């Protein structure tokens, strides 16, 4: 049988955290900071997808080009298969074509 | 795994409670039970 017997430990979500109470501050530093910066230059993450939504195949062409020279050795070879698989899948398979 | 089914036990006992008066392995085993509690209804 698969279901756990005693209740789990109760979760203590500190709702008035530092991260949580001040979430979304300095959003709209464009529209009322007179257009010095951009909200897309506030996003912290991977350099290839900083303010760019993309699709699963586009998320790999951009990674293979923006950081693709400086990637790890057998991690790059993995990505070149993945582009070759998602190209073969998006342009030859599916319904609705 | 994001999103495993945590309450699978309770979809099983919704079925087996109407099969508990059967005889054989259908009063315990869900694979055999749902072919017979559906035919009972």
């Amino acid at each position: 049988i698969g279901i756990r017997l005693t209740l789990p430990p109760p979760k203590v979500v500190d709702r008035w955290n530092e991260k949580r109470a001040m979430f979304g501050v300095y959003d709209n530093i464009g529209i009322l900071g007179n257009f010095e910066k951009h909200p897309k230059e506030l996003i912290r993450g991977p350099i290839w997808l900083r303010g760019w939504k993309g699709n699963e195949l586009q998320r790999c062409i951009r990674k293979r080009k923006m950081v693709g020279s400086r990637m790890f050795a057998d991690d790059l070879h993995n990505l070149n298969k993945r582009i070759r698989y998602l190209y073969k899948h998006f342009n030859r398979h599916g319904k609705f074509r | 795994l994001r999103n495993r089914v945590t309450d699978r036990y309770f979809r099983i006992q919704e079925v087996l409670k109407h099969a508990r008066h059967f005889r054989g392995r259908k009063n315990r085993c869900y694979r055999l039970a749902v072919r017979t509690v559906i035919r009972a209804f």
Partner: peptide
């Protein structure tokens, strides 16, 4: 271990429905 809490909470309402039948209250 699954991340559920409502599975495990609603299970021990079916352990108290199964405990008051076998060891019934006065």
């Amino acid at each position: 271990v699954k991340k559920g809490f409502r599975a495990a909470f609603r299970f021990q309402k079916e352990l108290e429905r199964q405990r008051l039948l076998r060891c019934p209250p006065p």
